[PDB]
Structures are given as structure tokens and as C-alpha cells.
């Protein structure tokens, strides 16, 4: 195998070394949302190859601790006070950066920030700030597969509106659209497991009919690297679905099998009922702070996005265009995390 | 040539070189006894193009290389034995390097070609190896020569050669081109 | 080429910064391969960076014909490559792939073209064939005319004669000292 | 050139008493356990020439010298500058081993070591050093010889003048 | 301008028009002054300090320079020639940078 350059202008001059941690890569990156699940792996991929990553974060020293180890001295720059509404800070963050990755998103609403702020206002303002600079060469935005303007869920609708605004301001931006991402710190399998084990009943919207294409986190991180190593990818949206398409019922059954649950704890909470149980609780969320007790699953938006098939469109770009074979999320290393809990020979 | 004549032990190597070898006959022992001193009695500058060799001939650093002044110590340098392309003599030299930088160039013994002497141009042209260097492929556009990758430059050369045919292609080799 | 001069459409400069201006027809496509930016690079549509004599292991022949070899004292700078590798890569790109793919194979090709190149470090005697050559070129030497020029050196300034020397600051100071 | 007459005596005597068993070229390199790509590197077997600054003959191949002077050196590879502190960074594992520790008394010893490990090598003989003064200044007496300007012409003598 | 100027020495401990011994540090960054290479601020440099100190008159044609007042708490002992020295063109201690001049050679 031959190492492929990062297709950035004048990279050939600055780059030097084998491509490792101590090598010099000509990529300075501002990854918004670095401390998040998706952002941390993107930071790891970029910094692993000797590049410098600027990580703006909302003040939390313990949350951004893993990012410190990611790179050599001076490569991972952690900026202490990040606000989505502060223009001057955004300009300072991307001052030296030639690639910008936006992984900032909220699964749930709060009193301080709504979907329309984070998923629409921040992308537009950041798009303008990046456009005025000119030094930034590559822009990558991470979105859900099911995001559509004509979507019942407010999250997936605001995300699509923000993506359209980004495409308008920066025409050469790439919209990465992965499926449900499986990982050690993911919110897919971890939430499903917590539902199966520490919840009285596991409500399943309809009967699990909705089809999904989960993908492994390492696959999305490698897809990001392949996006940055090709300039021909610019201006295109990639639907990074997994190798296998599965209904939610299959995933629930296979989690029950792997964990060796005594029996099936899932119940049938059909639609038109979650839309009445959670509808007031959304208004409850919008006027109260973040609470661990209730979140994400217990929302009408989650029910609305679990009544549709979040699958890649037939004619679409995907992993094959990036020459990546996605790994199965139901077997191998991907499934080790849930496997460690119980396999019936364990405890 | 930098001078610290206080460090001068009164050997006559520099004077003997300037007379027998260099042949400019500029240096002499002026004085008598302990206050005897070495150098041009008038204010004169050493004119031979073999002037650098007195620095190597000087045992006690009284004559030193002004370009290579206070820049490095001997133990810090890795020496590689190569040849000088300054002219067609092919003088055998030893290039001393610290890291990625050439620090100084000194001759080697080869009775066949250069006994142990090096010309000043060959000795002190390493300075021009740090300046006006080409690092990246450049392809011309309306904005001038601009940064390009190796593939793009080769594509442009291919498109150019496609037009030309036979003796329309012409090659001019330079002074420093090698056999390969 | 000598019988029927053809206006060149593509000119390849292999480190040639001292070309006469009439050599390039001024509408030709110029490829400059070299390691300093000079008169050659300024007149180039494509510039290909190459290593210098301190950065490459290359063969040079003396005025006596002794074959001597350089070593890589310091690594190549930026996105520059060894010159023979550049030409072979370009040969593959343009559709005429060259047989050799390694430095020893290039050295074997040099040995085939001229056997003395295999004897690095040794000068090979020449058979005295000079008289037969001049008997061969009887008509040509008669064709040659007389010029109103006197036998003299072509070296105007000794310190600057090549691109490396022209870049050197020390050589510029030497020239200023001589010219005052 | 006569003899060191010290520990080197027992060193040489231990050398001549003992010997090594012959093995096929390159077999020991597999036993070494190092990455096999190490032996893809090319070897130069040379003796350093004398530094021009100094006139000592110890480093040269001279009868005075009793130390190993033939080095195995590997070709130079890429080096860059640390972005933070400008330090010289490298990825070559064999950068300094050959220069620092691989010292051999004789060229055949280094060639045997390289062939035993499987390294391809090129041996470079040092330029011969002959301590022969030129005929003009062959001795101290030649400095004040008649060679400088010829035999003194005696046509200036008053007898010859008159 | 400084990008194509020949590196030169002011001449306090050297001559007015000599070459300055230079390494290639800072050549890529674009810095061409000695102090600029290692000091990035706008404060007073140590060279500015040493220029401010004035030459000191001594008697004789040679002065012993120990750098500091106590011999064992400074530079090695140095003997500096006072011949051909005046206030405008003083002799310099290489270790310390102190400047000296004497009128003794003029038979005074």
C-alpha cells in the first residue's frame, strides 16, 4: 500500500515524515464538537497522522481529557470558552485552519438552546465566517441519514435546513451522512442496553418495522479521512450506511440474544400513543435544564423518526465510492462492548 | 579569513603557503623577538583564490573561516566524503552537516587530483545551498508559476510533448547535471 | 539535428541556467529541472524540483576522465526527487517507459554505454586516435572559417559561475571586495 | 607498528586461538530477530579520511594507529524539523549505530560481517597517503640551494668588470 | 531589502564591512537579525544594554580583563592590546563586551 497525500493546496511543501504521530501533516483542523462521540474519533484520525487539530470546547476539563493524549506536543489545541453565538471566537478558532469539520448537534432540546439555534443558526453563521476567510479549503458537515426538509421530527428537519444553508454559502462543502453509529461511547447500543436492563419496560415504537443501516465509528472516521484525501469529493453528500440493513426488531432481538436476557422485555408502544404521552413532555423539556432521568428516547421526535425507514437512497454516494468496506456491526470487534456485559458463560 | 593573531604560535605555515603554493607573497613575519607578528604590514586583503587553505593549515585557530564563525563545534558535525562540482577538477571534499544543514566544506587527501587543497569557491559556496531553492513542482498559469503536484506537472509535460515531434524536442544539460 | 535545424517546440532544461537566449525560440514550451531558481526557472512553463550534489549519489567525470561519485550528505528538501528518477517517472507518464528501475540498473546502463563508468575512482587511458579523427573531418575543418576573436577565458567572474554560486551571499561579498 | 605490548596482545591472541563456524550468507540475519527490512538497506564500508584541520595520523590507516577504523555506514534518510521546537526529527532506526559502534580492524572483517547478516555492501578504499616531499623542497638544505635563482653570476666582480 | 542584503557586522568587536558568520536558523521564517531569531518581544535587547555602556580609560598598552571584579567569578583572564585605540574606536573584551581605550601609545 502507498500512502496517499492529503489533497490540500501546498501540502507537498509542508508535509514531511512517514505519516505518524511525530510526522508533519499539512492539515490544521478546527473540529467543532471535538469532545463529542463523533468528534473525538475524527480528532483522533486527523491528529494521529501528525496534523494539528484545534478543538473548541465548552468549558469542561474532564470531558476533553482524552483529546490531550491524541497528538504530540502542540498538535491538539484546546480552546477553553466556545459559544455558538460568538462570532469573534469562531474567527479566532479557524484563523490558522485550512479544514473545518462541524460535529455540533443536540439530541434533545433544553431551555438555553433549541434545535433551530444549534442546527440552523450556528451552521449559517459559521458558514459565513468560513467563507469570508478563504484560507479554509475543505469543509465537512456531519448529518443524519434520515434528515429531510419534509420530516415530522424537528431535529432531522432543522439538520437538513442547516445543511442546505451550508451548501448555499460554501458550494464545495461535503455533507457526511452516517447512519446510527455503533461504538464504545455511542448513543445507539448504549441506550438500547440501558432500556433493556435498567428500565421497567422497553417501549418499541410500532413493532420495530423501521429499517436502519447502522455503521461502526471507525468506518465513519476512515470515511472522513478518505474525504480529506480526495478533492474530487468536495461538493458531494455521502450516505455512509452500514453493510447490512436491519429492522429495529432484529437489532433488539440480537441484543437480547447476545446479552442472554431471560426473555423479551420489549413491549409494543405503537405510534399515535407515543405522540400523546411525549407531546407534553417536549414542552416540559423546553422549560427545564438537562436531566439524566428522561431524554432522547422519551420524546415525540424520537417516535417520529422511528416510524420512518432511515435508509440510504438507491442512487447515492456511499462507502464504495470511498473504497471502504464497512464492517458488520452485529459481529466481530464492533459487538465486543455489549458482549463483555453477559454472554451466558459470563456471570 | 578571520584573524585572532593573539592565538598565533609562530609557525610559518601560512607564510610558506602564501609564498610557495598560493604565490601572492602577502604574509610575512614582521617584527623581532616576542613582539614579532604575522600578517600584511599594510592593510591588505588576501587575493589568491586558494586563500581558504591557510585556515586549514593554521594549527591554532589564529586564522579562521569568517563565514563559518561561531556556528558549530567539531563534535556536532557528521562528515560525508563527496566531490566538488564547482569545476571539472572534481576536488575531493568532506561535507560536514548538522541535521539537515550543511555547515562547512573541507578538502580530503587525493594526491591524484587535489593534493589537499580546495579553491575558495568550492569551500564557501555551501552558503548558496540555502537560498533560492526549488521545493515543489510549479506549473505556469495566467497568474504565473504556481504550486502543483507531481502528477499535474507530468500531465502538463505530456500534453506539451504530444504536440511536439522529432527534433522539435530539445534538451539542454547544465553544468551540474550528473551522468545518470 | 545539425543537418536540418528545426525550431524547438519543447525545450528541456536539465539544470541549465547559462543557456544563450537564442537557444529557446521564445514560443517554446520550457521544462526546467533543477534545484535553484534562476534564469532557467524564470523562463519555465513547468519547474521540476531536483536534488543538489550534496543531496544525491551521482556520478561525475573529471577533465582527466576519472569517474567519481557523490554521497547524500543531507536529505532532499520538500517535494524534490533525484533527477534520474524524475526523468524515468516522466518517461512512464509520457508512454515510453525506460527499462531501468533502480540506481544499480542505471549504473549498469552507464557501464554499457561507456565501460570506464564501471571503474569508479580510476582513470582509464585513452588510445591515441586523435590523428585519425582529424583525417576523418578533413572537409569540415576546411569549412570552418576565421573569427575576429582572441584566445581568452570565458570566465568573467570566478566567484559566480553557476546557480549555486550566484545564490551564495559569501561569493557576492567576495565579488564586491574585488570590485572596489 | 612494532607492537602495542598491552591488553591488545591478549586480545589478538584470543582472536587467533578461536574461530567462528561457517554459515550460509544471510542465515544469521534471520537469527538476529530484527525486522527483515533492515537488510534492504545498503552498506558502505569505508575508512574515514584525515580531517584537514588536524595533522594527527591516529584516525587514518597508519602503522601508528592500533584502533579499528573501518566503519559500516547506512545511507542517509529523511530528516525534518519538529514543528513546535525546531528539533531535528527522524524515522531511521539505523541512523547512528554504524558510525558509533560498527568499527572493524580490516576491510575483510567488515565484509564478512555484512555478508553474514545479509547486507549488500560496497567497499571504498581510502585514497593512498604517501609521505613523499617534492623535489624542490625535498630537504631543509634545498631551501637555501642554488636552485632558487641559479649559481651566482660573477660578472659583477671588479676584476671581471675591469 | 533584508532578504537580499549581505549579512554584515556593525563592527564593535569586528570590522565595519566584514561578513557575519551566520547559520541558516530563521531563514525560512524570514528573520535575518541575531536578536530577532531568539527574542520575539519588543523589549530592550542585551546588545542594546552593552552598547549603552561606555568605554573605560586605562593606563598602559595592555589591560587585564577578568569580566567581573573578582577573578574567579567571571570570565577567564584576558589581555587586550590597547595599541591604536581611542574613544571612538575602543578595544573590546570578547567574553564580556566591555570596551577599553588608552592614550599611552601616543607617548602620553
Amino acid at each position: 500500500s502507498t500512502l496517499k497525500p492529503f489533497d490540500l493546496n501546498a501540502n507537498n511543501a509542508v508535509r514531511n515524515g512517514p505519516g505518524g504521530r511525530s510526522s508533519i501533516g499539512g492539515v490544521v483542523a478546527t473540529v467543532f464538537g471535538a469532545n463529542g462521540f463523533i468528534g473525538s474519533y475524527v480528532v483522533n484520525e486527523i491528529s494521529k497522522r501528525g496534523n494539528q487539530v484545534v478543538c473548541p470546547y465548552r468549558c469542561n476539563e474532564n470531558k476533553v481529557q482524552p483529546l490531550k493524549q491524541m497528538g504530540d506536543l502542540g498538535q491538539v489545541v484546546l480552546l477553553p470558552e466556545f459559544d455558538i453565538h460568538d462570532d469573534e471566537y469562531i474567527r479566532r478558532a479557524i484563523s490558522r485552519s485550512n479544514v473545518v469539520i462541524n460535529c455540533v448537534g443536540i439530541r434533545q432540546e433544553t431551555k438555553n438552546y433549541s434545535y433551530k439555534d444549534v442546527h440552523v443558526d450556528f451552521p449559517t453563521r459559521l458558514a459565513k465566517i468560513v467563507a469570508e476567510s478563504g484560507k479554509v479549503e475543505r469543509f465537512i458537515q456531519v448529518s443524519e441519514m434520515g434528515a429531510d426538509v419534509s420530516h415530522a421530527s424537528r431535529r432531522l428537519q432543522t439538520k437538513a435546513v442547516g445543511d442546505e444553508a451550508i451548501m448555499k454559502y460554501i458550494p464545495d462543502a461535503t455533507i457526511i451522512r452516517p447512519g446510527n453509529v455503533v461504538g464504545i461511547e455511542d448513543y445507539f447500543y448504549n441506550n438500547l442496553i440501558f432500556q433493556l436492563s435498567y428500565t421497567i419496560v422497553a417501549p418499541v415504537i410500532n413493532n420495530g418495522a423501521n429499517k436502519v443501516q447502522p455503521t461502526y465509528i471507525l468506518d465513519v472516521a476512515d470515511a472522513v479521512v478518505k474525504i480529506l484525501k480526495d478533492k474530487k469529493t468536495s461538493g458531494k453528500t455521502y450516505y455512509l450506511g452500514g453493510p447490512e440493513t436491519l429492522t429495529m426488531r432484529q437489532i433488539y432481538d440480537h441484543l437480547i440474544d447476545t446479552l442472554r436476557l431471560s426473555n423479551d422485555d420489549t413491549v409494543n408502544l405503537r405510534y399515535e400513543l407515543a405522540k400523546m404521552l411525549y407531546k407534553p413532555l417536549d414542552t416540559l423539556r423546553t422549560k427545564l435544564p438537562e436531566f439524566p432521568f428522561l431524554g432522547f428516547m422519551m420524546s415525540s421526535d424520537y417516535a417520529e423518526e422511528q416510524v420512518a425507514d432511515s435508509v440510504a437512497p438507491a442512487g447515492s454516494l456511499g462507502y464504495k465510492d470511498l473504497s471502504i468496506s464497512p464492517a458488520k456491526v452485529t459481529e466481530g470487534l464492533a459487538i465486543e462492548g455489549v458482549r463483555f456485559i453477559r454472554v451466558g458463560g459470563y456471570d | 579569513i578571520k584573524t585572532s593573531m593573539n592565538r598565533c604560535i609562530h609557525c610559518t605555515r601560512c607564510v610558506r603557503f602564501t609564498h610557495e603554493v598560493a604565490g601572492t607573497s602577502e604574509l610575512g613575519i614582521t617584527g623581532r623577538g616576542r613582539d614579532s607578528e604575522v600578517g600584511t604590514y599594510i592593510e591588505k586583503l588576501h587575493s589568491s583564490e586558494l586563500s581558504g587553505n591557510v585556515i586549514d593549515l593554521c594549527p591554532v585557530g589564529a586564522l579562521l573561516s569568517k563565514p563559518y564563525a561561531f556556528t558549530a563545534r567539531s563534535w556536532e558535525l557528521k562528515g560525508t566524503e563527496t566531490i566538488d562540482v564547482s569545476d571539472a577538477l572534481g576536488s575531493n571534499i568532506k561535507v560536514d552537516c548538522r541535521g539537515t544543514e550543511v555547515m562547512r566544506i573541507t578538502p580530503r587527501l587525493n594526491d591524484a587530483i587535489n593534493e589537499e587543497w580546495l579553491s575558495d569557491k568550492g569551500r564557501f559556496q555551501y552558503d548558496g545551498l540555502k537560498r533560492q531553492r526549488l521545493n515543489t513542482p510549479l506549473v505556469k498559469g495566467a497568474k504565473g508559476l504556481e504550486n502543483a503536484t507531481w502528477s499535474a506537472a507530468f500531465d502538463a509535460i505530456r500534453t506539451a510533448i504530444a504536440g511536439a515531434k522529432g527534433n522539435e524536442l530539445k534538451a539542454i544539460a547544465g553544468k551540474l547535471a550528473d551522468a545518470e | 539535428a545539425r543537418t536540418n535545424p528545426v525550431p524547438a517546440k519543447v525545450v528541456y532544461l536539465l539544470g541549465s541556467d547559462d543557456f544563450k537566449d537564442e537557444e529557446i525560440p521564445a514560443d517554446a514550451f520550457v521544462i526546467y529541472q533543477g534545484h535553484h531558481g534562476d534564469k532557467g526557472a524564470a523562463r519555465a512553463n513547468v519547474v521540476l524540483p531536483g536534488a543538489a550534489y550534496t543531496e544525491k549519489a551521482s556520478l561525475f567525470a573529471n577533465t582527466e576522465g576519472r569517474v567519481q561519485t557523490t554521497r547524500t550528505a543531507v536529505p532532499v528538501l520538500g517535494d524534490a526527487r533525484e533527477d534520474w528518477k524524475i526523468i524515468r517517472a516522466l518517461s512512464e507518464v509520457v508512454g515510453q517507459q525506460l527499462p531501468y528501475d533502480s540506481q544499480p540498473q542505471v549504473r549498469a546502463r552507464l557501464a554499457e554505454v561507456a565501460p570506464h563508468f564501471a571503474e569508479i575512482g580510476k582513470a582509464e587511458s585513452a588510445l591515441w586516435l586523435n590523428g585519425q579523427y582529424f583525417k576523418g573531418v578533413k572537409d569540415l575543418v576546411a569549412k570552418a572559417a576565421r573569427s575576429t576573436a582572441s584566445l581568452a577565458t570565458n570566465i568573467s567572474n570566478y566567484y559566480m559561475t553557476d546557480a549555486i554560486s550566484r545564490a551564495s551571499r559569501t561569493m557576492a561579498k567576495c565579488t564586491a571586495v574585488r570590485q572596489q | 607498528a612494532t607492537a602495542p605490548q598491552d591488553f591488545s596482545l591478549a586480545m589478538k591472541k584470543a582472536d587467533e586461538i578461536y574461530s567462528g563456524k561457517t554459515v550460509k550468507a544471510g542465515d544469521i540475519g534471520f537469527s538476529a530477530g530484527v525486522p527483515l527490512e533492515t537488510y534492504n538497506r545498503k552498506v558502505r564500508i569505508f575508512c574515514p579520511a584525515k580531517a584537514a584541520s588536524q595533522s594527527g595520523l591516529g584516525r587514518t590507516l597508519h602503522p601508528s594507529s592500533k584502533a579499528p577504523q573501518w566503519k559500516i555506514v547506512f545511507e542517509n534518510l529523511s530528516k525534518w524539523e519538529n514543528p513546535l521546537m525546531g528539533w531535528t526529527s527522524t524515522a531511521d532506526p539505523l541512523e547512528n549505530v554504524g558510525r558509533s559502534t560498527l568499527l572493524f580492524y580490516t576491510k575483510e572483517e567488515a565484509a564478512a560481517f555484512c555478508a553474514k547478516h545479509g547486507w549488500e555492501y560496497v567497499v571504498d578504499e581510502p585514497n593512498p597517503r604517501k609521505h613523499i616531499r617534492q623535489k624542490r623542497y625535498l630537504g631543509y638544505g634545498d631551501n637555501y640551494s642554488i636552485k632558487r635563482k641559479g649559481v651566482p653570476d660573477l660578472a659583477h666582480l671588479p676584476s671581471n668588470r675591469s | 531589502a533584508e532578504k537580499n542584503k549581505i549579512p554584515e557586522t556593525v563592527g564593535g568587536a569586528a570590522f565595519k564591512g566584514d561578513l557575519r558568520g551566520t547559520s541558516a536558523v530563521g531563514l525560512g521564517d524570514g528573520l535575518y537579525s541575531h536578536t530577532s531569531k531568539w527574542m520575539q518581544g519588543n523589549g530592550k535587547s542585551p546588545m542594546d544594554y552593552i552598547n549603552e555602556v561606555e568605554p573605560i580609560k586605562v593606563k598602559g598598552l595592555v589591560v587585564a580583563s577578568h569580566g567581573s571584579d573578582d577573578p574567579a567569578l567571571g570570565c577567564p583572564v584576558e589581555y587586550i592590546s590597547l595599541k591604536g585605540t581611542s574613544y571612538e574606536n575602543p578595544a573590546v573584551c570578547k567574553y564580556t563586551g566591555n570596551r577599553y581605550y588608552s592614550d599611552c601609545w601616543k607617548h602620553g
Binding site: 489545541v77 | 537560498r131 531553492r133 | 531558481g37 | 521546537m85 | -
Partner: peptide
């Protein structure tokens, strides 16, 4: 957050410690 090396991102004039000056092509 007072002292950082001169090659740091925080440094006003960040330093790439390159020891070679690069030729600048002529304009147009």
C-alpha cells in the same frame, strides 16, 4: 497560559523552523 514555545499555535508569529529560503516565482 503565559509561556508557550515559539512554534505553538498560540504564538502571535508562529514559527516553521525551516532552514532554507524558498524561491518566489516572478509575478504573472
Amino acid at each position: 497560559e503565559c509561556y508557550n514555545p515559539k512554534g505553538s499555535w498560540f504564538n502571535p508569529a508562529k514559527r516553521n523552523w525551516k532552514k532554507v529560503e524558498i524561491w518566489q516565482p516572478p509575478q504573472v
